[model samples]
Target chain A: DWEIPDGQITVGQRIGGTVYKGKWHGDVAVKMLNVTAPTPQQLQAFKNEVGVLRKTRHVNILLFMGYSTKPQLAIVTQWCEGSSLYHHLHIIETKFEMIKLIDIARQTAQGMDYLHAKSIIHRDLKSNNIFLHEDLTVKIGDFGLATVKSRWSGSHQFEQLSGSILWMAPEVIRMQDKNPYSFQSDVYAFGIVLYELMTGQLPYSNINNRDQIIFMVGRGYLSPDLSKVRSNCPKAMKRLMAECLKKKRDERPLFPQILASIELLARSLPKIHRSASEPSLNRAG
Target chain B: DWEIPDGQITVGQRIGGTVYKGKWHGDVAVKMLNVTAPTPQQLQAFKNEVGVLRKTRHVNILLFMGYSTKPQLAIVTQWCEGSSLYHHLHIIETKFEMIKLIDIARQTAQGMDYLHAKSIIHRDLKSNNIFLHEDLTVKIGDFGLATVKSRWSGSHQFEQLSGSILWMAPEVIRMQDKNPYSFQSDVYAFGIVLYELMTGQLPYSNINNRDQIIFMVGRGYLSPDLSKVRSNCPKAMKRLMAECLKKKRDERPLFPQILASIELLARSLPKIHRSASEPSL
Candidate 1:
């Protein structure tokens, strides 16, 4: 809650934000702003993030330890031993069984549910923002683009189009005449996360450019492939993804409904033994 | 909803209340009375079950299809392809891993929680009464001793002492100074069920007589041995069982709290692969 001295911090490798290994009771990750001379948007986001993280307290949401305002802008959070869900899915050899995969999705739903309940719209929600501990506990992070959603319903300009476009909703991409964006967009992002959990494939990985992704996914209404979402995947799991991926935001289920369905699917499968029929997620470096 | 003809019912092996292979839209288990001679107590229990099942409907609780009262008394329930939780645990070599074990207890908790919320006390809740479908869906059954609990807090004569002694709570056992029984007793029964789920050992299985079980468990305040609960067992799971098994009736956690704790524990554990370090439950 107070300004920190430089003596307490030891610097580490870059991770989007300038990550440094820091100590503040619970061995923490100190994420400092990229520039000492902060831009207007950068300072607003950092201050807004500290403000957002202060109110929301949940097991699934990332734990905000403390932050510094003076010397340079930095926020301290709980460090996870494992990489982001994106890194694990697209970059590593480690594989997740059906139960673990669903658990990860459920954990994501829990954090999103917690956020939406508080009317905190996580404008950026995707596999990259989700962190995993070695014990497989999930914590949703990155509030740089998060905004307090204004109203339940009414016409408004689409705010925060800065989120990753692949996970971005079509309504958001199109930014229509009336009520262009709302919390429903987060549900659409979570739908993409579900697809990644099932197949470990990046959203539109075959496509080369962001404009093509925006054109195909946002404009063309193309969903990710299901061929990799193996036979062992629960029928309900497949069905849930379809429900989440609905092009029209009104048709898509809310976070709580998504959670209930995920839990039921998790309960349906008891065996943890990885399916042999499923292909390896790992590729040669 | 109507009377059933004997010809349509293909009789099967005897389970308690006489289970037979039968049909009612969905393939179902027809549970008929043992005596055609019709003991009044048997008739009352059969009629009481039908009345109770008619009112309650849920996924965790047994699916009640139809009942017959005319020529014979038979209750139809959705047939579980797999056996009861009790049959799976102590009888065969089949073992339940911690996740499945917790799932079974959680399912039981869900049903009991639903019942208690509606003031329906499942006077008898044990592994034997819990059935598991092939897909691992759990359904709680055998509402023979269940009663609609009357008040939140008040004194009353101890009712329904006829429930199984081993799983019975001390409050119900003593029937002494004050309000002898309420929904808290079911939480105590579920505590023993947690033990049974953890260690596949019967509650006081070694003791030959019911009187001994009554004295040892009820009066002596004996809980089942935890020698087999094993290493990989979640420390929180053991702690929850402790909370549920509190000797003071008020100390025992309610069904909802237990359900909440169980869900947290379930979430903590993502991998379903059985722990070899943990003994067979």
Candidate 2:
């Protein structure tokens, strides 16, 4: 365990945990527990979270450098100069071109496919957890709620409620004693992330009440007004979203199938959109 | 001690020791001992080096982050993305205009002034030791041979030879029992750096033998031909170089006095040169 020196970390973003710029050998993002005083449950969850991170290794997945036991439990990973996908969409003002948006969507799906293949589940897949490197390479990070399960059985359900309500699958929310949340639950969350990227808005953001949205989602309703999404988004992309947000878990495409469909859609995009170079500044505006 | 994870460092210039891009909480440069094996003398020097670094704290002076004992003995400091002054002059091509050169010269002198006031002598002051930030702010770093002295005493020199011979002053080279290296030695080295910047050439490049140059320098010979320097340089800069390269140690002006002269010289230049704003692309 690395004993981090005092005054080494400079704090940055604060969501649940505070992310800091720390030096291990070079610049790295070190995340600490949100509350100064942690409950036993939080501490156990932190240890479990480290277990999942240690097992994971993929280019699309975030690279975990190391962690510290002393100086409050902190996890360090490679620091991306550019921040999350949420930053590009809402926080900072930059008009993303159509092709660039599709490329991002494809990369996100690729990361999800890798996670699913490893028999691990990233229960919370949101735009905020998806980070962007300097070159705009997408990485799936922030694995506070990730879990590992066997391949043969899909009945590994959490006893307690987990993940963001807006992105949660209906089956997970309305879980019975017998039927548990499966790997396909992540595909449901990905659909909302896809919609959020297509239209620069949150899923069901119009519905202010969190409980009301969860109740609606439990009653087999998914996503917001399709009228806004349908007009701007491509037909292929809309079709993929519809498949992901299916009422039944089995109906939703698995990650590899989802990856195959996105790759096809990405190739089918117009030649102008498929151009490798960065779009013009005027286009960004 | 910070347990530096392997392969976090990106390689940079190597002198006696290799400098690495180390992260503490932010990007920093970590310098380590050169050899695979270390002797007691090398280890002792490394310990003494960090002692001087801990006492230093000035805006112009480099900030030492921390050192490690387990993996390898290493000293950490703030990482400047913009690299050394020598890099700018020769390694990479940049058409350094007159205004930019003066800005660098002024900043270097300002750092030296601060060091002198603290009673610390930077034994090795060269273009390589001087670092530039992303904004082109100059910082003096790499204090491996730095020493501190009381206000009254001027003579303090080592028996063994130290520092790069090319930059060493005449008194330092001809160190008899009476005369030893002093604070004025740095000023002499600064003169060579100034010349190097102006001409974009190393001092005494024409001289092939290092030993012969050392002998000539000991017998009151200082620097290359003035005519070589005169063509490209401004009159005031040339005059300062002459004062700095005086064979007699006492004749050389101190850092504070040098700073005053440079500030005046900087003002007399064209308005375009004095402006702090970067020249238009």
Candidate 3:
């Protein structure tokens, strides 16, 4: 049996079990235990998730490398060089100001398009899971909630616990009534992220409590008004954000459709000076 | 007294001459003698034009050192490290291909915008005058006819002999219409360059004589048939070329507008891979 190291270990933490005589071996970023160590069925489910992730090669979705099951069954994945997009927007304000946002959007859409094409749903899509490197290379992360969404008769059926409340689609909030909240639901969450970046604020940050947030979003409380940010933001981008948060899951676009929408939005944006550095320009009205 | 070089200075042939020696010297480049050098009044006019060019400085526009009255009356200017856009485009073909055409339009529009903003008109806008350095730096050359139209409108005004026949605006061909073609007229000519580049063929190469080409353009008999090259070109760019070639001078866009148009077109075209020796992609 593998002995666990004497150190901090918890859910969502970096990987790696032991310091084996002070020399690091194997992947360091081992995700801590979530809920309880998977039962046999849960273990198989975890394997299924990794299998879905392993086959995909996309710019947006996080890259999965290998897995370890014998020693506590952790999915050894590709380490994201980029800090989360959430930290990037708030902590590094100057870095955000230096580069073109459309460039970021374009790259994100490209990656998202690939993920959507593979029938892989990134349920918990948010800036925190969206990582970036020094070169502004973006990749999606936190595939714990990612799974292959099933489609029957061209209609998708997804799991209810597939998304985060703050970033979830309206259909996802009404998961019981809505055929388990499909891939377009993920696109709806992406819309929330788009709004957050453009406005430099979370979609529904005003509602503090998680329960109230769920209540508000479930009752069709639209993502915070984008018109507030439109004075500085380009008009087409405003339209793009509006389309992203379309309350109806069917009304909202698919991940690729959303990507194309923003790609078109990028084209209409203020002419960005072709900058070699991290170029940042706020969305202009 | 200006002395012609003591050589067998034959007509229609290039003769070597040292220029801008005292207080004026830089790089060497080819120079041609106009059939008629401007008279004293014309020389004064040319001097004023040179002064305007001297004031307009951008990385893209080739620089002018100084003109010499003594050593064969040479107009000294910046020497391009690279050859003509002619060679750059036709390096692999008779005319430039799609990718090079898009790059040229984007760069030329930027240069033209600089000129138009200063109210300086480059009456002689042609592929020959657009030279490239070895590093792929672009510079617009030979503003013999560049004239400042205003103080605020500090750009040049065109005479009949301003631009080449192939690239001339339609109104430019209407016999001595000196309502000096505005910045948009340059845009119309810019479209011709776009046409020449995309098709790898001149816009009106079917006609041999310069006057006949001018007449055909004047009568709306000549324009780029973009459909012929649509397979290799972007649809948005094809639309931009069509919009640029509108017959009426007013129908054509101003320089700033053209700059915006070409920039949009540039985005539509696939990114040109940066060349090392020819870096600026």
Candidate 4:
């Protein structure tokens, strides 16, 4: 195998990495997969990911720089400097404020709106995939588990829970049948994503399998104590977050509809830059 | 040096192979922190985590069995399967329309409510920290990142992002000062978790930095289109999801409020059990 090997290019050795081509001489990410290796369907899924990235372009969506098929496999994507949102919130001290949190929600809504219009589903919507730019722009990433059957495979027969299991929707987790899943389930996942963005944590990260937590999530269970978060965050934005993470898929707003609310939210809040001098008051104000 | 260790039972390694204490012959997971370890603040944080876990108990919460502090190191915690919520989601699949995503949201809300009411904040919440048992009960995990501080920590300080970047709130990305974050921020993070549980994926895993996503999340980035999921999903639920994902922390609903809406939602759906022969219209 070494005899026919080409020059070595480094890909960060972790869950996702890549080799650079073109002007991306710097660090870029590449997702690795094999067609006839392991599961052929897995390889196909990788291809589908590439197809989505190759054609789709939006500020919220991750950028697809390039890719190489056959013998050596890779999907070159733009890389940003930062850790996952989970880590970000862990160490940060001043993560609370009405204006600051609101901005993030608005931008995320805009990004999702763009993706949804194209009919492309990002199965995974956790904060782990949301990339932030120096200018405060968020770009959605990680399409390896994406379901683009509608665009390439000519069908919408993707599995409900084949993607990130923790972020799975109730429609997906509760269903016993083998029939194809729908996009509304993606909306359900979006609700969870919205929840994580505000709380800086996963909803049920502490429980075991078959726990009421999972059942609650699967059955569109909602808690009324979100006022607890409101006690710590902006009152308006807290209500907005509730709308995004609702249990019923139909109850959840469409991407565009969600985006509209965010736009209004953005308008409701004071300008991001202007709020620098304002006092940090608790919601009790 | 010549004697074999007396009560030093070793536990199996975590995913990263970090050795910890295991209960008697069982696959127990416990965090072993040295008494004379690093900094006093670090030790305090460790103790605080144990305190929160001990006081907080929910069906979704991982149980805290036992702990010790007088010895060479301080060990605390209980019998856990060591399965993270992220891992459980990866393996568990739906067999039929037996469960509902909204229910998971409710249970997670209940768990969070327990912590929030107790003023224990889970600073780092993600799929990796959550755990799911064989049953569908929900629990909040990873109290290590929690903070007991109810009020702001004086000044607003911005520390480099820690924990999972994907789950960071926007205010966290933009450094205001060194003040301890408020619990409301946790609500923002909970919104993201809710989105993930229903969707089966993260909203922005593609990006590397939590701050970057924070910026966009602040700026109002729309999530993936749900119309692309299944067609039968309720529009009301979709609208509810939009509400949950709003950029402003103030705009998002409280866990209890969400619970109220979700409870009503669960009741709204028709109670119809179906077999393979009865596919919906």
Question: Which one wins on lDDT?
Answer: 1
**What root-mean-square deviation over C-alphas does model 3 reach?**
27.2
lDDT by residue for model 2 (B1-281), tens: 22345454444545446677754433567888757677887887888788777665444577665666556778877667786887877666456777778778888888787667666788899988887765456778889888776444444433377778778888888876443657799898888778776777777778889889889988876465656663647788888888887888899988878878887887887635446687678
RMSD (CA, Å), each prediction: 15.2, 12.6, 27.2, 29.0
Model 2 DockQ reads 0.03
* Model 3 reproduced share of reference interface contacts: 0.00
Q: What's the lDDT for residue B168 in model 3?
A: 78
lDDT of each: 0.74, 0.73, 0.61, 0.58
The residue pairs that clash in candidate 1, if any, are none
TM-score of 2: 0.49
Could you tell me the lDDT of residue A30 within candidate 4?
Answer: 57
**Per-residue lDDT for A1-285 in model 3, tens only?**
122343322224322322111111212245423435667767766766676766554334454534555445555444444467788777775345413565666566666666665667767778877777444567777777776765553544333364567787766776665355567777777777777667777766566788887777778764667755635667776777777788876776775566656666666556657646755544552
Candidate 2 predicts chain B with a TM-score of 0.84
**TM-score of every candidate:** 0.47, 0.49, 0.43, 0.43
Clashes of each: 0, 7, 29, 266
Give a tens-digit lDDT track for model 4, residues B96-150: 2413566666667777765775677788877766665443445566677776764
Query: TM-score of chain B, per candidate?
Result: 0.84, 0.84, 0.76, 0.77
Look at candidate 2 and tell me the lDDT of residue A250.
89
Give the lDDT of residue A228 in candidate 2: 58
Q: Model 1, stretches more than 4 Å misplaced?
A: A1-7, A151-160, A177-179, A270-285, B1-281
